[PDB]
Amino acid sequence: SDAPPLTLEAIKDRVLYVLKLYDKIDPEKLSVNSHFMKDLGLDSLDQVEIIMAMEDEFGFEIPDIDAEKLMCPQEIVDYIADKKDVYE
Amino acid sequence: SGYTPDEKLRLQQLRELRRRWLKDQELSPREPVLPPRRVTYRHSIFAVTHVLIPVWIIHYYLKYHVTAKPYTVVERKPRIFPGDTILETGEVIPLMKEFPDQH
Amino acid sequence: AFSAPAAYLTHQQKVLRLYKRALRHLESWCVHRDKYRYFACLMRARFDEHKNEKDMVKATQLLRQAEEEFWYGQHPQPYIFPESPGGTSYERYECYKVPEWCLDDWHPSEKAMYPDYFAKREQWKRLRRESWEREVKQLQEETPPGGPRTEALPPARKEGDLPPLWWHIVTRPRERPM
Amino acid sequence: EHGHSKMELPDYKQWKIEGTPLETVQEKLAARGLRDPWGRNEAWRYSGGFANNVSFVGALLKGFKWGFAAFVVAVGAEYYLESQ
Amino acid sequence: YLTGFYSKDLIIEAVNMSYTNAWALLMTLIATSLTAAYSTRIIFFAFLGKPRFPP
Amino acid sequence: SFPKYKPSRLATLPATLDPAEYDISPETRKAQAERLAIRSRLKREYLLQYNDPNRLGVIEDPALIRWTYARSANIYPNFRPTPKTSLLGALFGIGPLFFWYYVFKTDRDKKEKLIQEGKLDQTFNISY
Amino acid sequence: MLKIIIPTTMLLPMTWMSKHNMIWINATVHSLLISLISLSLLNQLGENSLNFSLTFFSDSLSAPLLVLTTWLLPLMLMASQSHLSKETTTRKKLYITMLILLQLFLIMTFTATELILFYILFEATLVPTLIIITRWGNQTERLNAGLYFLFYTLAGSLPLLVALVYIQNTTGSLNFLIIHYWSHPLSNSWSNIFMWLACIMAFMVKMPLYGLHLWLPKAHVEAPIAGSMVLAAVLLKLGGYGMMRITTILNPLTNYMAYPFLMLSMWGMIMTSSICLRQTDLKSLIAYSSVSHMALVIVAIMIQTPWSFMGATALMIAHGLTSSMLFCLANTNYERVHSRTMILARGLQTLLPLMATWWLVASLTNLALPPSINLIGELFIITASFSWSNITIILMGMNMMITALYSLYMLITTQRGKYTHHINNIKPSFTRENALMALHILPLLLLTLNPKMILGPLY
Amino acid sequence: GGVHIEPRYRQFPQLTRSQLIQAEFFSATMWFWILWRFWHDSDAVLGHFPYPDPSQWTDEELGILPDDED
Amino acid sequence: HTGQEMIISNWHWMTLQTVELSLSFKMDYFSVMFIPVALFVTWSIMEFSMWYMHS
Amino acid sequence: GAHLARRYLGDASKEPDPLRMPTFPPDYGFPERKEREMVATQQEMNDAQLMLQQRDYCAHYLIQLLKCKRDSFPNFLACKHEQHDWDYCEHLDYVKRMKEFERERRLLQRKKRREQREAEMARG
Ligand SMILES: CCCCCCCCCCCCCCCCC[C@@H](O)O[C@H](CO[C@H](O)CCCCCCCCCCCCCCC)COP(=O)(O)OCC[N+](C)(C)C
Ligand SMILES: CCCCCCCCCCCCCCCCC[C@@H](O)O[C@H](CO[C@H](O)CCCCCCCCCCCCCCC)COP(=O)(O)OCC[N+](C)(C)C
Ligand SMILES: CCCCCCCC/C=C\CCCCCCCC(=O)O[C@H](COC(=O)CCCCCCC/C=C/CCCCCCCC)COP(=O)(O)OCCN
Ligand SMILES: CCCCCCCCCCCC(=O)SCCNC(=O)CCNC(=O)[C@H](O)C(C)(C)COP(=O)(O)O
């Protein structure tokens, strides 16, 4: 396998990397605690597209009932860490 | 849509407890303790205790026990061609009748 | 898996799920990235043209021919992530997950190794022993009469309290125990 | 000994649609009047060493040149040695 | 002049010149054509295009 | 227009193509609420019985015991002899026996007749 | 033979004067010692028999069954040691007394040079079994099971007594040697047909034949562990042994009186093999498997060819050992689970690996895997039935496939998969259970080296 | 057993010279073998013995009489 | 080199009247040729598995 | 293949079937009727124990090939002249079989022509 033990800061960096390449949102305004519907004015379909992008980038797929209620990068990071059992 | 405040708080507390439990799963340097107690060369010994000894045992078994009984080991008779000589008799098989050879 | 479900799915949830499935199967059909992006943008365009419809009878009339069209062109062999419920490695490691309570049956000679781990284990067991007594009362006083209506559990409200029914969620074996 | 070296992710501003076949997608979406928000996200698949691709036939003859040179050398050596 | 040649070429040659069923002949020929086709599919889809694996 | 998906016994109708949840009425929502309510009640009971540190046994499942009792020990007391049951019993318990008897009797009669005529070529049939 | 019967009798005073905390040790040790003594009987000769005296004789058909009977008792004691922990001393001694009486009756039955003595002990073997089933049984259906087991057997075996006394009145002797030497053909008459039915039905009910097997699932499910093993291993072989002993005087009537029973068995093997697939219980599944195997043995005996008899004896011994092992494993699972349901406990291989190995070996042996004696008997019967008629191969192959299917279903449902979450009393397997499984399985893999010891007199 | 290779995250992975030269050598070996065998053994593919034409065979050696003798 | 063929019947398992079952090995062309191929493939597969299944 | 297409699309009786051939006496063509020669006797071919299907008119070259392969064993490609000779002899045998097929075809052609001419003369 030789898979490195991905950590919380690595997950956050990857999440922000994926988000900053989504040109619908400006990289400067976004923050780890920024919202999606209100702080960035993104559509529901747009949020689904972000969720699918993180799905493709991380190699594991999020169930719909849990994907439809993720609205901040911080809670996305927390969900991924809980899925992958990350200590720190 | 989205997390309700109760859901957020419960998930946060569960995450904290889960991370504490996972961190507690780590093993310290002295955590694994084993009590000790006792009562070319590698290939050289390997070919002796794994190849040579089975050859000896099986050769003995076939030569002096299996072949003792009749018909246990039966060998297909070797092919005889024109011109060969037989060890047991010494007679020579006659050759062919010189078929016409072109191309 | 984590979140408790609702009694029903709203129209918005159905539309979002159909959108996700359609995009996934379109990606499966269009192997390459540029083709996938082009046709995903086209599908988004054809998907948002009825975004602002007001009446619900016509919206429910839609999303039916949409589902039929999806079922007709669903790529009978879609792409499934390896850890998904259809993937190649769905339950591969489910044979390595040994429950925590098994450690209670270990021989004392086996427990002689890893002493610190078992000390922390006793601490966790004591914590659970007190927390359960608090949680049963908290849940008893918090639930409405006639039984719960949804399977959502409340968090901890006091200072020393812990969330009700936490032991078997916190002590999951691992994602890949071995 | 495991893979612990504190890998650092590249800068996000490096990935551009320029020099990739995503221009055709962007242009044909703009002709009908839309844009692809995720265009840059996959630019890395066409940017680095992955930029150059090899055709199927060229893939099949992976070592044709070296093999042909060795074959010619061997044939010449056999010709000059057997003629003796 | 590869390992598969010394077997498959003789298989096809012997099959072509025996008092056998004709439908089996046609099926075998189409089968070897499809063998070449799916070998091409494997190579093209796994070694030629642009990368598609996670980052 | 697209070809319709016709469901069968071994290929059921998908939930998305089903029309029951598109004709929504308040009583349907009430029914879904009651279903979720009873399911959550059962789940809460199971979880209360499941996380108890004092419990050191197997959680008895009334549903499993009821299913086993219905499958095994409740068949005869609810059985009544009816034309359908009687016909099915007679057929499935008598027909195969007589079918196989007829087949084997015919085969053995043919073999014995060939033996009597002597045209069977039983050479080397030493073991029997 | 008295060198075997006398120590078995002395086991009773030995047990009754033992200390309160040492009955199991003494019983096990002396039962094992008795088994060693019984090993001497195995050296049969190609001639008639080992005619010990006017009352007891031993053949190469009786020798394997006698050795298995003497070997089973220590295993029964080790199996019963578990659930009798909270039992008073007198009741434990009574249990051991019942087991010893059962062994003594079986030992006296299997030789029994005279047919009336054979019948007397053959019915005497019914009282200790009924007491064991109806007294030390857990479920409330043990009473109905005991009634079924008693009456199904007795109704079939009562006309046998009349047939035997009639034969003695006409023939003049019931000694098996005289019966074999002075045998005369049975004419085709209604009286002779009913004599055939009376002499056959008593053994066919106990085997059991398909259609009269209703008592077996009840008796096997409701009985304790020791009763289950003694039923599946030895008590089922009484019918087949009696049938192979008594078919010497029913010729040539059998040549056409075997058709109903042959058809019933060749269809009931398929029916019970299919039944095993859809089963919610483990002990019931094993009982139906035993019914299928005994139906195959019935077919073999009714064919009446040397290969049929050899295969029948081999299958008898192999099925006895395999069914005893399977019942042992099911009991070990039930003791921890306390439910006796196949799908209630799952994924036990992750928690108990060695018991998973024992499960795999037992299932493979039941699956008739070569070169185990299970497949030796199976294949001999298959070839004999093929010689009887070329169409039997269809039924036999269908039975083989279904047997493999339900054996691996039993293995997979209980061993593979994800463990059940709400069970946390699966303690590590004791040394007693592992030793029990090892002592069950090792004789099978040892007998596969010397098949001639279990191939019967027609070897 | 090997060397330490670290992940790249959207860049081309590190390639050691050993694997490149080894793959090139083995591909060259295969092609050289094919060419050498084709040079030495051409009849294994093209055939070695001509296929006779049955129409060109005269009636003299086929035992045909000019429709009058028999 | 020679064209050696051989059958070895070492252990006599059991005799059933006129039939004899013994542990007999046939070492004709097929067996003597398929032993090395299978052993070679198994050796390569085991060496590959020492890396594939290290975890 | 063309012969199969001709047989299954034209007239079946026009040209033969492989199963029933030959349908004409060997002496119909020419009266000298030379005999095929065999240079390997029963006994030496039996000792070489080639195969039942390999005991054909080209057996002597096969025996020489076997002798050459057995003698120069380590150099597995030492002897190829006799391999080519055996291939040539098998090619000649196939040529003779083709000759037989075409001879039967033309004989049947002339037989059909003779029958048609006789029928026309009788009708005329
Ligand atoms: C290197 C050697 C390898 C082979 C070793 C083989 C050892 C075999 C031991 C097992 C023997 C099995 C028991 C056999 C019993 C049947 C025979 C027995 O009934 O014979 C009796 C005789 O039995 C012996 O006297 C006693 C043997 C009993 C003990 C066997 C040895 C092992 C016993 C182990 C017991 C526990 C040991 C201590 C544990 C703490 C009566 O004989 P009898 O009918 O008059 O003979 C008449 C013919 N005569 C006149 C020629 C004699
Ligand atoms: C249910 C679970 C299984 C239980 C056990 C099942 C086995 C019992 C079945 C009995 C076996 C066969 C019985 C009779 C066999 C003789 C052959 C006879 O049946 O065939 C014809 C006989 O014809 C008629 O069958 C006459 C008998 C008819 C009356 C018998 C009852 C038939 C149906 C009853 C079935 C009930 C079975 C279960 C009872 C509880 C031939 O006519 P014929 O050649 O001239 O006479 C031959 C006899 N001779 C030569 C001595 C003169
Ligand atoms: C699990 C339940 C099984 C029940 C089994 C019951 C059926 C057993 C078969 C019949 C038993 C009775 C047979 C009688 C005992 C044999 C004695 C004998 O053979 O003597 C005959 C006598 O034969 C008889 O008397 C038979 C009469 C039968 C009366 C009782 C009938 C019982 C039921 C009959 C049908 C059952 C058959 C199938 C049963 C299948 C199982 C349910 C000779 O008469 P002689 O006087 O010597 O004449 C010579 C001068 N000519
Ligand atoms: C290869 C497979 C092809 C499959 C093709 C599938 C069919 C494609 C065409 C589908 C047709 C439709 O759009 S069916 C149209 C269904 N009806 C409506 O959309 C009315 C109002 N829509 C909403 O309110 C949603 O929430 C929305 C605003 C979209 C998002 O809201 P968010 O603000 O919360 O993101």
Give G267-291 as a DSSP string: HHHHHHHHHHHS-S-HHHHHHHHHH
Task: Provide the greatest CA pair distance for chain H.
Answer: 94
CA distances from I9 to B59, B62, G253, J15 (A): 14, 10, 44, 56
Query: Considering only CA atoms, which of J73, J75, J93, J74 is closest in space to residue J85?
Result: J93
Q: What tokens does B44 get? A: 């050289």
Q: Are G316 and G324 in contact (CB under 8 A)?
A: no
CA distances from I32 to D37, G36, I3, I28, J69 (A): 65, 47, 11, 6, 19
Query: CA J50, J51, J57, J61 torsion: positive or negative?
Result: negative
Q: Which residues of D18-30 are buried (b: 16+ CB within 10 A; e: fewer)?
A: eebebeebbeebe
Strand order in the sheet with I19-26: B73-75, I6-16, I19-26
How far apart CA J77 and CA J64 sit, in angstroms, is 15
| Cα–ligand 1 centroid distance for G43 (angstroms) | 14
CA distances from H50 to G21, G174, J91, J95 (A): 99, 90, 9, 10
Which string of DSSP letters, residue by residue, matches H17-54?
Answer: HHHHHHHHHHHHHHHHHHHHHHHH--HHHH-SSPPPPG
How far apart CA C9 and CA F32 sit, in angstroms, is 11
Q: What is the CA radius of gyration of chain D?
A: 24
Q: Are D66 and H24 in contact (CB under 8 A)?
A: yes
Substitution site in G191, G256, G264 for ligand 2 pocket (most atoms within 8 Å of beta carbon)? G264
Q: What is the DSSP letter of J36?
A: P
Q: Are C99 and C173 in contact (CB under 8 A)?
A: yes
How many CA atoms are closer than 13 Å to the CA of G81, on its beta-carbon side? 20
Q: What is the CA radius of gyration of chain G?
A: 21
Q: Determine whether F107 is exposed, middle or buried from the number of CB atoms within 10 Å of its CB (0-12, 13-18, 19+).
A: middle
Question: Cis link prior to G252 (omega < 30° from 0)?
Answer: yes
Say how many C-beta atoms besides its own lie within 10 A of residue G133's C-beta: 24
CA distance G335 to chain F (A): 12
Find the distance separating the first CA and the last CA of chain H, reported in whole Å.
Answer: 88
Which residues are registered as beta bridge partners of B92? B85
Q: Determine whether A87 is exposed, middle or buried from the number of CB atoms within 10 Å of its CB (0-12, 13-18, 19+).
A: middle
Q: H43: which chain J residues are within 8 Å (Cβ-Cβ)?
A: none
Q: What is the DSSP letter of I21?
A: E
Substitution site in C12, C15, C28, C49 for ligand 4 pocket (most atoms within 8 Å of beta carbon)? C15
Which string of DSSP letters, residue by residue, matches D28-43?
Answer: HHHHHT---TTTGGGG
Q: Determine whether A43 is exposed, middle or buried from the number of CB atoms within 10 Å of its CB (0-12, 13-18, 19+).
A: middle
- Residues constituting chain D: 84
Phi, psi of J108 (to 5 degrees): -65, -35
How far apart CA B82 and CA J45 sit, in angstroms, is 9
How far apart CA G458 and CA A86 sit, in angstroms, is 71
How far apart CA G236 and CA G150 sit, in angstroms, is 14
Q: Are C26 and C40 in contact (CB under 8 A)?
A: yes
How far apart CA G306 and CA D30 sit, in angstroms, is 90
Instruction: Select from D2, D3, D15 the Cβ nearest to the Cβ of A21.
Output: D15
Ligand 4, atom nearest to C63 Cα: 14
Q: Which residues of I18-40 are buried (b: 16+ CB within 10 A; e: fewer)?
A: eeeeeeeeeeeeeeeeeeeeeee
Q: G452: which chain I residues are within 8 Å (Cβ-Cβ)?
A: 14
Q: Are G150 and G219 in contact (CB under 8 A)?
A: no
Substitution site in C9, C12, C28, C74 for ligand 4 pocket (most atoms within 8 Å of beta carbon)? C12
Alpha carbon dihedral G365, G367, G371, G373, in 10-degree steps, equals 60
Q: What tokens does G183 get? A: 């045998």
- Helix, strand, coil content of chain C in percent (nearest 5): 50, 0, 50
How many CA atoms are closer than 13 Å to the CA of B81, on its beta-carbon side? 17
Which string of DSSP letters, residue by residue, matches G369-380?
Answer: -TTSHHHHHHHH
Q: What is the DSSP letter of F2?
A: -
Query: Which region, left, alpha or beta, applies to residue G146 given φ > 0 means left and ψ of -120 to 50 means alpha?
Result: alpha
How far apart CA A14 and CA A76 sit, in angstroms, is 11
Q: Determine whether G240 is exposed, middle or buried from the number of CB atoms within 10 Å of its CB (0-12, 13-18, 19+).
A: buried
Find which of B76, B77, B79, B80 to mutate to test the I interface (most I CBs within 10 Å of its CB).
B76
Q: C124-130 long-range contacts, Cβ below 8 Å, gap at least 24?
A: C124/B21, C124/B24, C125/F53, C127/C162, C128/C167, C128/F53, C129/F53
How far apart CA G14 and CA G28 sit, in angstroms, is 12
Q: Are G269 and G295 in contact (CB under 8 A)?
A: yes
How far apart CA B24 and CA C124 sit, in angstroms, is 10
How far apart CA G319 and CA G316 sit, in angstroms, is 5
How far apart CA F113 and CA F119 sit, in angstroms, is 9
Q: What tokens does G327 get? A: 């019942």
Structure's resolution in angstroms: 3.3
Instruction: Find the angle CA(J62)-CA(J66)-CA(J70) to the nearest 5 degrees.
Output: 170
Q: Are A14 and A73 in contact (CB under 8 A)?
A: no
Q: Which residues of D43-58 are buried (b: 16+ CB within 10 A; e: fewer)?
A: bbbbbeeeeeeeeeee
Q: What tokens does B62 get? A: 């076939």
How far apart CA G34 and CA C65 sit, in angstroms, is 81
Say how many C-beta atoms besides its own lie within 10 A of residue G213's C-beta: 22
Query: Which region, left, alpha or beta, applies to residue D53 given φ > 0 means left and ψ of -120 to 50 means alpha?
Result: beta
How far apart CA G111 and CA G83 sit, in angstroms, is 34
**Residue written as token pair 């690595």:** A10
CA distances from C72 to A10, C59, C69, C75, G72 (A): 41, 21, 5, 9, 65
CA distance B17 to chain A (A): 11
Q: What tokens does D3 get? A: 């893979």
Q: Cα–chain-centroid distance for residue G240? A: 10
Give the nearest chain F residue to G337 (CA atoms). F58
SS3 (DSSP) at E41: helix
Question: Cis link prior to J22 (omega < 30° from 0)?
Answer: yes
Which residues are registered as beta bridge partners of I26? I7
Q: Are G457 and G59 in contact (CB under 8 A)?
A: yes
Q: Are G292 and G284 in contact (CB under 8 A)?
A: no
Instruction: Find the angle CA(C62)-CA(C63)-CA(C67) to the nearest 5 degrees.
Output: 130
Q: Are G185 and G248 in contact (CB under 8 A)?
A: no
SS3 (DSSP) at G51: strand
Q: Are G282 and G340 in contact (CB under 8 A)?
A: yes
CA distances from A87 to A14, A52, B8, C121 (A): 17, 25, 20, 18
Which residues are registered as beta bridge partners of I8? B73, I25
Q: What tokens does F109 get? A: 């009669």
How far apart CA D27 and CA D23 sit, in angstroms, is 6
**Residue written as token pair 């009336």:** G116
How far apart CA J82 and CA J88 sit, in angstroms, is 10
3-state secondary structure D4-25: CCCCCCCCCCCCCCCCCCHHHH
Residues of A tagged active-site: 43
Task: Provide the greatest CA pair distance for chain A.
Answer: 41
How far apart CA D46 and CA D14 sit, in angstroms, is 12
- Name residues 3-22 of chain F within 8 A of C (Cβ): 3-5, 14, 16-17, 19, 22
Test F3 with C149 for CB contact under 8 angstroms: no
The continuous run of DSSP H or E covering H9 comes out as none
How far apart CA C14 and CA G223 sit, in angstroms, is 56
Test G418 with C168 for CB contact under 8 angstroms: no
Which string of DSSP letters, residue by residue, matches B3-70?
Answer: --HHHHHHHHHHHHHHHHHHHTT---TTSS--------HHHHHHHIIIIIHHHHHHHHHIIIIITTST
Query: Considering only CA atoms, which of F48, I1, G419 is closest in space to residue B79?
Result: I1
Which residues are registered as beta bridge partners of B85? B92
Spatial neighbors of G304 by CB under 8 A, at least 6 apart, are: G247, G251, G254, G258
How many CA atoms are closer than 13 Å to the CA of G340, on its beta-carbon side? 20
How far apart CA C135 and CA B13 sit, in angstroms, is 14
Q: What is the DSSP letter of I19?
A: E
Query: Considering only CA atoms, which of I32, E6, B91, B99 is closest in space to residue J63?
Result: B99
Task: Provide the greatest CA pair distance for chain B.
Answer: 107
Q: Cα–chain-centroid distance for residue J12? A: 23
How far apart CA C172 and CA C97 sit, in angstroms, is 9
Q: Which residues of G214-225 are buried (b: 16+ CB within 10 A; e: fewer)?
A: ebbbbbbbbbbb
Amino acid identity at E38: Y
Alpha carbon dihedral F84, F87, F88, F90, in 10-degree steps, equals 150
Q: Are E12 and E28 in contact (CB under 8 A)?
A: yes
Which residues are registered as beta bridge partners of G50? G58
Phi, psi of B75 (to 5 degrees): -105, 135
Q: Are G256 and G187 in contact (CB under 8 A)?
A: no
Ligand 1, atom nearest to G33 Cα: 35
Q: What tokens does G222 get? A: 């409701």
Q: Are G374 and G315 in contact (CB under 8 A)?
A: yes
Axis crossing angle, helix G62-80 with helix G306-337, rounded to the nearest 10: 0
For ligand 1, whether the C-beta of G36 sits within 6 Å is yes
How far apart CA C74 and CA F5 sit, in angstroms, is 13
How far apart CA D11 and CA F22 sit, in angstroms, is 49
How far apart CA F75 and CA F79 sit, in angstroms, is 6
Query: CA G258, G259, G264, G270 torsion: positive or negative?
Result: positive
Q: What is the DSSP letter of G234?
A: I
How far apart CA G107 and CA G101 sit, in angstroms, is 10
Amino acid identity at C158: K
Residues of G in CB contact (< 8 Å) with F are 141, 259-260, 262-264, 266-267, 280-281, 284, 305-307, 337-339, 341, 344, 383-384, 387-392, 395, 421-425
Method: cryo-EM
How far apart CA G452 and CA G317 sit, in angstroms, is 12
